[PDB]
């Protein structure tokens, strides 16, 4: 009965939507919360896999898609749409990873249901000196044929010092 995470995340979105009249405020909160979870998740991940430090953005994609996702969500997103420079790629999923159904009529058109994941991705990667942008550019819950998360390498974060 490991549907605990899904049910719990569902209640959080429902509760944040009542606490904030504006959906943009929910997306912002979901992203910050995700970031905070992301910083913790990275430690847990490296400790359980020992994959090592990546060097290219291409290596990061294979670890995130073939190892991280499989370990935490039991799924393997596909990697496509690489930029000629290799500083951007997309994660393709059959459906929304965090949510199965949404309440109708649609009162949250601008609401990014699983925005937490994007924060998790950004927070985890920031811990490994990579400033990246994770963003849903396609979502099955939005009517799209697939769920697509675009990953963009912004810059290399300087060491703490």
């Amino acid at each position: 009965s490991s549907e605990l995470f899904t049910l719990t995340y569902g209640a959080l979105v429902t509760q944040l939507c009542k606490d904030y009249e504006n959906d943009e405020d929910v997306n912002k909160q979901l992203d910050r919360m995700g970031y905070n979870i992301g910083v913790r998740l990275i430690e847990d991940f490296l400790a359980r896999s020992n994959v090592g430090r990546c060097h290219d953005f291409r290596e990061t994609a294979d670890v995130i898609a073939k190892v991280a996702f499989k370990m935490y969500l039991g799924i393997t997103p596909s990697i496509t749409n690489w930029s000629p420079a290799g500083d951007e790629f997309s994660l393709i999923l059959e459906n929304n990873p965090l949510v199965d159904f949404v309440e109708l009529p649609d009162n949250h058109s601008a609401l990014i249901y699983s925005n937490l994941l994007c924060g998790v991705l950004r927070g985890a990667l920031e811990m490994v000196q990579m400033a990246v942008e994770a963003k849903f550019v396609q979502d099955t819950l939005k009517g799209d044929g697939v769920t697509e998360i675009r990953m963009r390498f912004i810059r290399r974060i300087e060491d703490n010092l």
Partner: protein
């Protein structure tokens, strides 16, 4: 989803959704508890006395949610029960004794929500002995 994910999410929820706040956390746990009970072998409790329902929560529900059974169950046989987890998972120094209540609210709802699905009305509160020992108090009015 992986076990650790729930704890990560729960920790952030307590921080962000920081007594009306506890009411909110408990309220959320209540809806989740309802759905979870719904997926457990509810049928088996048909024709059973209240006592078995609470054992159900200590075993069937606690395993499903925390991958472990309750460490002990006590009762006054007058509708009140005390469930004890000697090492509660969501509790990841004496300085935190006052903060612990915040991390137990959601689970109180979880328990209350599960009881609801089984047709039982109740009030659930929690307290901490010596961290990480937690006692959940279930009160079934009658």
């Amino acid at each position: 989803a992986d076990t650790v994910l729930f704890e990560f999410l729960h920790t952030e929820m307590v921080a962000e959704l920081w007594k009306m706040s506890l009411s909110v956390l408990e309220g959320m746990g209540f809806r989740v508890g309802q759905a979870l009970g719904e997926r457990l072998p509810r049928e088996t409790l048909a024709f059973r006395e209240e006592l078995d329902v609470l054992k159900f929560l200590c075993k069937d529900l606690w395993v499903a949610v925390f991958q472990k059974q309750m460490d002990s169950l006590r009762t006054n046989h007058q509708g009140t029960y005390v469930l004890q987890d000697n090492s509660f998972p969501l509790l990841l120094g004496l300085q935190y004794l006052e903060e612990a209540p915040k991390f137990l609210a959601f689970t109180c709802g979880l328990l209350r929500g599960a009881l609801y699905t089984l047709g039982i009305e109740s009030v659930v509160t929690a307290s901490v002995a010596a961290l990480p020992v937690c006692k959940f108090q279930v009160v079934i009015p009658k």
